Design a protein around this ligand. Structure first.
Ligand SMILES: *[C@@H](C)[C@H]1/C(=C/c2[nH]c(/C=C3N=C(/C=C4\NC(=O)C(CC)=C4C)C(C)=C\3CCC(=O)O)c(CCC(=O)O)c2C)NC(=O)[C@@H]1C
Lengths: 172, 162, 162, 172, 162, 172, 172, 162, 162, 172, 172, 162
């Protein structure tokens, strides 16, 4: 598994170099912004059940076929598997957000997942939609916490979105 | 690669678990230490040429027989590989400082170290001596927690070679 | 019991390894956070009686049918057990704050939670509502990082009940 | 596994109580002294190989019977097992020093160890002596760092000694 | 899917074994019970609409707060999903009766039950009440071994929800 | 595992004999009573959760010390382990009731269990009391099913009691 | 694993329906015919060794190439593997006959088996021939039992044949 | 020991499960078959002496060389052990009948059969012929389902010896 | 296939090890024994026809009932398979001799032996008697260590059949 | 595992010595006699089934209690376990005879075996008697080989006896 | 696994034949040459570390790309994996030389190895070169033993080369 | 301890098997080699004092810096331990010779070798040079297969140190 710092080191080593001032400057900024990053990761962890639940309720209000006989979120066993998947993906997204790097999400979650769903007959576009709904609710929590110092987290919100959007694009 | 951050993620992941306040406090320790660590990396990077130069020459001062004909400190190529190897150690120390963990050293130097050195007849003593000389020199370049950081990773290497 | 310190030791131990700078930086994060955490624990401890009392009432406020004859909020014994249970949650939140991790909550409340609640017919919704009400009140007692600490452990419980 | 904070919580729970002022004071003191504690743990880790080796050389200079045929640190296989044990014990001592609690040392190392040695015919008083020689060298390093802020670490040194002395008394 | 027949086959198969008189006697018990079971299934199928309707209404009599605005028995959608869910249970009870085992209920309702209900805030108590009501009604529609069969699968569901 | 028939065969084989008339007549009567036996087993299975939950409520009302800090049904983890044990014992008692023989209960449940409890510090008499309380509720259900043909089940009730009483005596 | 009843339930669920009259009547006929089905399964089980032996004798008379050096039922190890396969296939065919459904045969035996034989260099048509030879002898026993009530089992015989014929076609 | 009842209990137990309607229907098949089985056992028990005598003599009719000097059917002891063995088989057939499964035969004859017969030079041949003879005789003693029961266990033995 | 050489290689390989003097001395034992072994193989090969013919006829001398109508030594096909089988045994004995181990016999005769013989009703006693007759005859064709070698493999078979 | 040569080396090492001319002369004896030793081992291996069967026939003729109901070599399962034990002991005895040392017999067979038999209710003196009978038949084969060079094997026969007698005394 | 003798037997069995004069005479010459074969195997075993190390030095002097950042024998972990591979291949080549047959080298080493290297991004021709280099140094030792009886080992040297060349061609 | 004999027994034992001709031929190779091996052991035993002295002195000739103050060949204790260690190697070579395998060397020197040498700062190069000198000297005392035996075990050590 890599993080943002480790990613830079791997690239500097392929050049046979000590890290450049440019690379060090990017890592210095990440350290500077790291408290906001910890709040952002905290927003997802502290509201994980709610994020999955808000997203699930919206998905099945939109795609009522999934909760009918013949649908892939029916019967209870399929619904449970579905909710478990939403939890897994949200977990790996939040790990990537602490790390500042998508490699844990790609290596331990997304790699080969579309193929697994296609073999199972799970509609991959509906899984992607679930991820998109979780992104929206998760980003709402990152933006609307209890008693955090007010400031600009737009960059971290944009970054969190990329991890969700990478999951969705990899699955769909 | 092992850093505080990859470590706490591995921990949560081994338990099928979201990161909680336990891991986030840990991660804060990494982030709070970065300033001291990056100051250390900065000083080792900018003095790298003279640190490597002096370390190589100390190896020859401590083991003078090495620079005699037929010995492993004799000739342009043996001596260039020495400077290169010592430069690797210093490079990976700066990486570990910046990375918030031993991972760069573990992955690139420590894994396979004895087997490699045994096959190519490289004495750990040479490298220990080079690292002790670098440690002496770094002691006048840094102080406080930057020094404590630098010393930790230098000592880590010395121990990995012992 | 899970704390940053038991975590990093477990980590080193699983690899047959001495603690290195990776784990020591992590441990520093625990120690640096202790002041904010102990300030949160202090405030929750000194307001415990009124926090518990108001939380129990808010459960009956939200689910009024409970206080009717035959229901699980009816009678001195049912209501005493409520106040006891909510006190338990608050006590284990203060323990987790002081301990530098979720371990006290994990070991004493979260392990076995659903099984126990299922057998004794205890709705998680009651406890979620009690905890939300405590969270509202704590928001006026604390600010800054003490608040962030308190909130984390309260939210942890709400999630474990969801 | 317990640490100093966790130990207090377990005791407070058996009373049905929030932690007392007195308990919180001990724990506040440990936090206050924690940077010294980190330096003390760092002294052992950074000098681990030297601690084992200094102790080993002294043990076998004192007890030359161990390195003769018939002795328990002969042949190479027994010597290696011996050195490995010294490292194991020093590793669990240092874990206990970060924790501020001997439970990790007791639970994962000392529990049942004397019995193991007796079954093997390993002289338990010689193992104890090894532990005592490691304590001396380890404490020398705690007191002899490079460029650490000057101050009084006598309390931490005394605590480190208790962990080594627990190991020795448990084994002998 | 678990029936007497799949279960005796699994048994012989787990031992690398031809079915013998042990398993064939067991299978005969399934076949001999089929008449009573099918009589139960027919009665539950033909009275399904009124059994579902009365069950849903009994949930609202037992938990009257549910039909108030903002509650989970309020509105045509919430109430349509209730009738659907209760019809699900009745349908899987008839399937189990006809199948000679709990397999249909196990595979389609019991597996994932608590996780699903927890996420969508569905109280098992509602369903237990609906099933107790159905049981009361079925008691006047069947007697003898058809009744014993119907009751077994109704009770099975009540237990799975407890 | 043995059942009532298999138990008779094992005894007849030790004599080198075909089963006697006396042995055959007791097996014939078990066959005759087997529908009632199936109803009695069905009474426990169909009401298992409530038997456990009724017994548990009564135990912790009689012994409030178990559900206080320091007690063996505290915290949640110990209460869960306790409830699981009640479930396990009830499950093996009901197996013994289908079999007409206590050997499955003894071999797969009771054997060595008191020793386990003593090692753990679980109060064995409180476990015994839990078993007795489950017996009472279980026998209540055997005696009051819905729409079963009315008749005398006193022998089967007494036999069920012996299996519960055997568990209690083994544990206490 | 599915049986005839379970197969019908799965289909009715995909329609969101209680079982139809038509489905119930096929299942009612299967129950009506179930004693004959038990006799038919019993005919295979009671004569399993002879079914394999008669089929094996005939196969090696028809294909003497298999029992010469270079042949796939030579040496003793390959002949033993061959006879074991015949027993396995006959075992799964008889399971299918009790179930009234081929899924156990298809899922636990036939799935991927041709590919396995092709990779081994086992002549797949000779395995198919073996299966057909076992069908003939097995059906002979179904039709020639000891003191069974005389009647018509032609439908069950056809069904048994389908299971053997599926095996052969899947392998060949 | 394998019977329908021990088998269904083993099934439920392997899944950590209370017995349900699946296993209770199975058990009913055992109990319903008991009458036919016990009628078979009674007929085999009461004609045991003549069934054994005739079976032993049929072995010698089929394999006449056995009764010549030096052969394994020669002398009082060889012939007494034959009658004893054939009596064992018949005894375990009656036990299996009464027990509702093959368990007695499996545990007392089948387990170890080939290893034992190989060491003592006992031809399965002889026993197969003894059992076929017994089967012929039982065919005039029993009819209907008692016959079907007796034949199942006799054929089980013949198969175990093949 | 098991020989001294494959066995010592398997040994070294199981330990991740180069062959050392341990295994080479072993290998020398194989090579030193080859001359005696090949002399045995040559004598068994050149007398093969008469060794097989006599062995088959000794089976019929020992078990005369076999050559009666309906029996397994009756007819050209039964008798041709006998000669073929006995030729197999002798062929695999010569192979084992030449190979420096039991591997050819193990792999081609012994693996599956009892399963096969049980299914085709082949008595091990026939083959034991054939092999004892071959042993008698070989005793006049060889002496010394060639005889010891031949006898070892003949006895190996007799044991495998017991 | 040790052999005769390895045993000598171990003892010489405890003295810190090269092997003595006495120890070397003792090993030279064993090399000189090794062809006889190979014939002796070969006698047991080549006649293993018959040693076990001759011994078994004699045991059960003498102790007819063992083959009656209630006896420890009844039913077939116990007789098979008994015969298997005779084979295992004979196998380890013959290993010992190639080695010239009983350690393999002691370490991998005899160690803890009496205790196992006592727990099982197997009559240890009857096992010991089985071992005695196998010794007698085994020694008969060592003495009556086919076409071996004639000479004196009394020392090797006595040694073989000691390994059998070691087993019997350890078990009884 | 096969050896030269076993290979001949397998072929004679496919013909249904005793081994021919021709087959026996090439096996007789292998026996005749077997002492030289043992010396040749001993040359590789006794000089294994040296053979690997000289080949490794030469490879990295020819292909300096491999020991630079970005190269497949960098960092230490990759160099160690590389050296381990050289040892593995040399071990299986030497096994083949004792056996007089390449099957152990093919079956337990070369089978699928090129594919493994291609998946890893290891340059297969550089591995082949390493094998080539080991062949040269290994043959040097076979030709230059200490105090071995002089004679002609050209045939065995040619055979050793075939096994090395086999490995190189399989990998490249 | 590994010898040809323990290794063939281990082989048979791992397969639950009696020793057969495969293993007995191997064992014969051990016994046939004993004469050469014992001749080697005796020459190395009787020359042990001068072989050790010359070997120790050659280490000092090859690495002269060792005998300077502060170095690991300086002083009577350092030099006494050298002579002791080299005598250990020679003793275990003779044991291996006599034992018919590498077992004595494997169990007493090779297991733990690198870990021990690393901790006490013992260069394998010193011991390699000592062993090469002994090999030169043995070459004039022994010839033929005794020489081949001695060289095998001396080279075995040199390799274990590389
Ligand atoms: C007592 C055991 C019987 C007996 C033995 C005896 N054997 C020999 C001689 C030899 N035995 C062998 C046997 C082997 N060599 C091997 O490599 C193997 C494993 C494949 C075996 C089994 C050999 C080669 C010889 C030497 C040559 C020969 O054939 O004689 C003797 C003669 C004395 C000696 O030690 O060499 C004796 C006495 N003698 C008896 O009478 C006992 C019944």
């Amino acid at each position: 598994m890599q993080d943002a710092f480790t990613k830079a080191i791997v690239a500097a080593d392929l050049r046979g170099s000590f890290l450049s001032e440019q690379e060090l400057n990017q890592l210095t900024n990440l350290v500077k912004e790291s408290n906001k990053r910890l709040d952002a990761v905290n927003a997802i962890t502290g509201n994980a059940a709610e994020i999955i639940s808000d997203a699930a309720h919206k998905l099945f209000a939109e795609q009522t076929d999934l909760i009918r006989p013949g649908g892939n979120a029916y019967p209870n066993r399929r619904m449970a598997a579905c909710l478990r998947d939403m939890e897994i993906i949200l977990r790996y997204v939040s790990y990537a957000l602490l790390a500042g790097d998508a490699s844990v999400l790609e290596d331990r979650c997304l790699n080969g997942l579309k193929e697994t769903y296609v073999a199972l007959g799970t509609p991959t576009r509906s899984v992607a939609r679930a991820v998109q709904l979780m992104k929206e609710t998760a980003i709402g929590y990152v933006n609307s916490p209890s008693g955090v110092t007010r400031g600009d987290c737009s960059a971290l919100v944009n970054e969190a979105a990329t991890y969700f959007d990478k999951a969705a694009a990899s699955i769909a | 690669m092992k850093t505080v951050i990859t470590e706490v993620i591995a921990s949560a992941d081994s338990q099928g678990r979201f990161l909680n306040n336990t891991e986030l406090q840990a991660a804060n320790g990494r982030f709070q230490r970065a300033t001291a660590s990056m100051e250390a990396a900065r000083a080792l990077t900018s003095n790298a040429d003279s640190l490597v130069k002096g370390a190589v020459q100390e190896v020859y001062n401590k083991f003078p027989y090495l620079t005699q004909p037929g010995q492993m400190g004799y000739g342009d190529t043996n001596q260039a590989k020495c400077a290169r190897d010592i430069s690797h150690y210093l490079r990976f120390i700066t990486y570990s400082l910046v990375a918030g963990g031993t991972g760069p050293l573990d992955d690139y130097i420590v894994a396979g170290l004895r087997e490699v050195n045994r096959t190519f007849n490289l004495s750990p003593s040479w490298y220990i001596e080079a690292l002790k000389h670098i440690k002496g020199k770094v002691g006048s370049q840094l102080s406080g927690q930057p020094l404590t950081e630098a010393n930790a990773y230098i000592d880590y290497c010395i121990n990995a070679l012992s």
